[PDB]
């Protein structure tokens, strides 16, 4: 029982900003502060090409700082904000000031209620529960 | 070993006319004219008499000998073909999804849609001399008529085959268009 099943469509092209090992903020109230990036789904690489995730992706991660109940296990998360500038159909490039993610079950459900900070557009279309829990969506 | 002489005798009946030139056989009857080219065998095709046609092969080996009777039989088919034609009936078989059919006025083409519920369009163009027909009373059948056995049997084939079911147990599914009746005389 794994994967991204609750994704609602195609995810747009975003410059991949979070390779493996990347540690990002965790914006949910799950009680985990951060997410250590282990893999990213749907990737077959080239030799020695680091697996990379971006806004909207579903990663496989672990919790480095947070509730002792959460760390030491392998969880899935969904990237919300990234600091790596990507580009949108208007030609403008954007970025947030942090790298943020929300722990989720493979079905696309969040474990948590409030999501701290804004969530990127590119995450909403893909993940309606995440979108539901957004305070703001840019 | 090598066989000396082998012959086969083809009868020619009322209203049939036959022509052998350099292995090229022509047969004209009431229903039309059919021609076939035998240039590939060393056989002797004797000048036909309105009664008969004699086929001979000389200094032959077992493999060669068979070509005789087979060319002969092909002739039998040309003849019978121009006397009484050839008609086939193909039953159109489906379990759940009804096979939908559109046949042109020439009778020269068939469209098959909705096979196993597939959204694809099947196109089959009938061979020369072959006419396809479906009536109100046909009870889900097709009818292919023509003078030349080959073109008709082959058209039936192309049809049956266009609809072969794939990537599933063939013995349970069994959807398809199959030949119910072969070698009918009209």
């Amino acid at each position: 029982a794994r994967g991204r099943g609750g994704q609602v469509g195609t995810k747009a092209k975003v410059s991949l900003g979070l390779p493996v090992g990347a540690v990002m903020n965790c914006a949910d109230n799950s009680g985990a502060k951060n997410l250590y990036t282990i893999a990213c789904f749907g990737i077959k690489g080239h030799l020695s090409k680091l697996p990379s995730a971006s806004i909207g992706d579903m990663i496989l991660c672990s919790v480095k700082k947070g509730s002792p109940k959460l760390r030491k296990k392998v969880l899935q998360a969904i990237v919300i904000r990234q600091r790596r500038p990507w580009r949108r159909r208007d030609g403008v490039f954007i970025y947030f000031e942090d790298n943020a993610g929300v722990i989720a079950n493979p079905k696309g459900e969040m474990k948590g209620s409030q999501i701290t900070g804004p969530v990127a557009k590119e995450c909403a279309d893909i993940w309606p529960k995440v979108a539901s829990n957004a305070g703001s969506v840019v | 070993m090598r066989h000396l002489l082998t012959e086969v005798n083809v009868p020619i009946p009322d209203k049939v006319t036959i022509t052998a030139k350099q292995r090229v056989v022509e047969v004209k009857g009431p229903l039309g004219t059919i021609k076939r080219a035998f240039r590939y065998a060393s056989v002797d095709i004797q000048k036909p008499t309105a009664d008969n046609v004699k086929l001979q092969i000389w200094q032959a080996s077992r493999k060669e000998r068979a070509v005789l009777q087979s060319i002969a039989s092909q002739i039998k088919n040309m003849i019978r073909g121009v006397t009484e034609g050839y008609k086939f009936k193909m039953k159109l078989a489906f379990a759940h999804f009804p096979i939908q059919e559109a046949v042109a006025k020439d009778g020269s083409s068939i469209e098959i849609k909705h096979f196993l519920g597939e959204k694809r369009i099947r196109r089959i163009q009938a061979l020369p001399g072959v006419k396809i027909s479906r009536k109100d009373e046909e009870k889900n059948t097709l009818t292919l008529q023509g003078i030349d056995l080959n073109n008709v049997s082959q058209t039936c084939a192309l049809i049956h085959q266009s609809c072969l079911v794939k990537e599933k147990d063939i013995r349970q599914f069994l959807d398809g268009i199959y030949v119910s009746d072969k070698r009918l005389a009209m």
Partner: protein, 52 residues
């Protein structure tokens, strides 16, 4: 559907013979295999009939 027809299909589909060697489906009631790989081998079986 329509056993009158099921007959037909089943005769086109389940009613053949299979080569214990090249796997080809040969005509029922036939003695030999028509495929070069086995040299027309003797041993053949009935294509396994469906269930009841």
């Amino acid at each position: 559907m329509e056993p009158t027809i099921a007959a037909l299909a089943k005769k086109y589909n389940c009613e053949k013979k299979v080569c214990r060697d090249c796997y080809a489906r040969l005509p029922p009631k036939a003695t030999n295999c028509r495929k070069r790989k086995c040299g027309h081998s003797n041993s053949l079986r009935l294509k396994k009939k469906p269930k009841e």
